[PDB]
């Protein structure tokens, strides 16, 4: 008889590490159809801010206009979501972008010859020869000066090489950056790779003491199998360390003496970030979207 | 197409999440059906798949000139040791999970890195649809031309199929 | 052409690591193996995108119709 | 090692085309049937 109080008494979270960009943490005794949904939402449903409409005024560089407009869209912006609101799709263009939906970036780079001694590197030889992502200048439009003053819009990786120039050439553009979900286009995906793995289980069956236990060390990563003697022969130290390479199942000394399965309700999530949000906080967004995906289906009528 | 004559059309731009992710977290860019291999015998592609994954890990380029290897020096044992030295499976296989159900897949999936190509003949100039269209001046029949967007031809042989079914009003 | 902004497969930001990688092979005289791991490219889907890049833009930039010669 | 992509030799050649002699001399030996045939119209013995 399954109950939600039975789930609360046997659900643990063991966080391994938590960096500013990546978080690693285990979920124990939850179903694979629920933990899949958390990976599912962190990639797709969790919203983010990406450039969507790009307005060129003059692009005379080598890179095409539709390519350079695509490269700006893949630039991750360090804008917190839940500051912008969702733009409307079925309202016209003069009313569509506001100071509440949209962040406006711009870029105005001209390349000029530089008189330098001499082959020669183009950072010495041309002025503004490499366009970087930090040259996207945030233009605070509307009332976005009293509310984005603490947090100005900067690219999360400011050294993304956007374009290259030679003198005479220029790029002059103005990109509108709007909120969206990663299931529409992959540029709104808040996470580099949100994924889990299932905890490996190494079941030694016969005692494999002796010199054979030294060559059973080598069939796993080094922080997996430990040896002491014939006593304390071969015990699994940390099965979380093991990648499932099945190198032990191609030896004839150990085809019978081990079994390689998984612990079927022990997940090991690995969540990176695109920089806009911390990875422990795009996990809370994921678990609340699934709840809000279900309240909206509960509190909802049925006609015919 | 790969470099082994294994061409194929894109059947579906398949979404990201329901696509089998790996223990590493990698999702493949191209899924190719394993049934295209027995009839074609392209085993140069099975060895390219685990030579481009060993070469992506260790940061090296592998020579693939013909007749470098020999029947005592099989490249599945050459490149296979390079994957075992990096802590991957010896046979190129990787444990993948399901994108839909989240459960682990039955057997380990053969994943690697293959150099793909894209062919210049594309299907953008193929379809047409006709509802009333321009007609011809002598016979008052629909006009030939994808530019005028009309004139699908029920020719000599397609008439014989409509007689052979016995349907008199599909021929009419 | 220029370095792709993101990894194709996983999606980690790669386009800020091309000018760093050419210093790790010229200045520090490293191999391709340690130069990728120092930049933090640890999944082979995103190691193969810095490792394999051609950088054809420096060959296209030599044809400038907007300056003499 | 077995092979190598020449990833600092390519980049130093894209920026700096060779001023003395073409690299990749097997690519000019691919059309020496065609160019040398046309060269024999106006060069060689007997003009």
């Amino acid at each position: 008889e399954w109950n939600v109080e039975k789930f609360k008494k046997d659900f643990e979270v063991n966080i391994s590490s938590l960096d500013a960009r990546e978080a690693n943490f285990d979920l124990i005794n939850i179903d694979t159809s629920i933990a899949n949904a958390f990976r599912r939402i962190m990639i797709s449903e969790v919203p983010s801010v990406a450039a969507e409409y790009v307005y060129f005024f003059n692009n005379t560089s080598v890179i095409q206009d539709e390519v350079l407009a695509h490269r700006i869209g893949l630039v991750p912006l360090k804008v917190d979501p839940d500051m912008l609101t969702w733009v409307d799709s079925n309202l016209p263009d003069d009313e569509k972008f506001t100071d509440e939906n949209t962040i406006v970036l711009s870029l105005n780079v001209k390349c000029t010859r530089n008189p330098d001694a001499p082959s020669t590197d183009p950072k010495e030889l041309y002025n503004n020869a490499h366009v970087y992502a930090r040259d996207l200048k945030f233009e605070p439009q509307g009332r976005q000066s009293t509310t984005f003053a603490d947090c100005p819009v900067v690219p999360a990786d400011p050294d993304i090489l956007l374009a290259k120039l030679r003198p005479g050439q220029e790029i002059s553009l103005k990109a509108h950056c709007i909120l969206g979900i990663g299931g529409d286009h992959a540029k709104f995906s808040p996470v580099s790779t949100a994924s889990y793995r299932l905890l490996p289980q190494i079941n030694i069956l016969q005692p494999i003491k002796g010199e054979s236990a030294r060559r059973f060390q080598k069939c796993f990563p080094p922080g997996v199998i430990g040896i002491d003697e014939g006593s304390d022969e071969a015990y699994v130290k940390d099965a979380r360390k093991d990648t499932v390479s099945r190198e032990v199942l191609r030896y004839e000394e150990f085809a019978d003496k081990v079994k390689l399965g998984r612990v079927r309700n022990h997940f090991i999530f690995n969540v990176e970030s695109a920089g806009a949000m911390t990875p422990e906080e795009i996990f809370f967004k994921s678990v609340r979207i699934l709840k809000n995906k279900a309240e909206y289906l509960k509190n909802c009528p049925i006609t015919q | 197409s790969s470099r082994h004559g294994q061409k194929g059309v894109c059947s579906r731009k398949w979404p990201t999440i329901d696509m089998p992710f790996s223990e590493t977290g990698i999702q493949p860019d191209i899924i190719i059906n394993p049934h295209a291999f027995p009839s074609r015998m392209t085993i140069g592609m099975f060895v390219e798949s685990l030579a481009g994954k060993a070469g992506a890990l260790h940061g090296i380029a592998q020579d693939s000139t013909p007749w470098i290897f020999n029947e005592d020096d099989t490249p599945a044992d050459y490149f296979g040791e390079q994957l075992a030295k990096a802590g991957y499976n010896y046979h190129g296989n990787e444990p993948m999970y399901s994108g839909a159900t989240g459960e682990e897949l039955r057997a380990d999936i053969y994943v690697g890195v293959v150099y793909y190509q894209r062919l210049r003949h594309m299907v953008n100039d193929k379809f047409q649809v006709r509802s009333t269209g321009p007609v011809n001046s002598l016979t008052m029949q629909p006009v030939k031309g994808r530019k005028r967007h009309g004139g699908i031809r029920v020719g000599e042989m397609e008439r014989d199929a409509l007689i052979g079914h016995g349907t008199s009003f599909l021929l009419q | 052409m220029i370095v792709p902004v993101r990894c194709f497969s996983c999606g980690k930001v790669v386009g800020d690591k091309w000018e760093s990688y050419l210093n790790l092979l010229q200045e520090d005289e490293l191999d391709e193996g340690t130069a990728l791991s120092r930049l933090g490219l640890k999944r082979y889907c995103c190691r193969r995108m810095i490792l394999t890049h051609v950088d054809l833009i420096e060959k296209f930039l030599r044809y400038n119709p907007l300056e003499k010669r | 090692r077995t092979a190598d992509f020449r990833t600092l030799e390519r980049e130093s050649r894209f920026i700096n085309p060779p001023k003395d002699k073409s690299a990749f001399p097997l690519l000019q030996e691919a059309v020496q049937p065609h160019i040398g045939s046309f060269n024999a119209l106006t060069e060689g013995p007997d003009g």
């Binding site: - | 223990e23 040791e81 990096a86 | - | 077995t2």
Partner: peptide, 24 residues
């Protein structure tokens, strides 16, 4: 015929998630 020469100096470069360089 000499066999195809093995590259000398290959190390482990696939660790499971959260473990980076902790094997000595």
């Amino acid at each position: 015929r000499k066999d195809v020469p093995k590259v000398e100096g290959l190390k482990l470069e696939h660790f499971a998630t959260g473990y980076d360089a902790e094997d000595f």
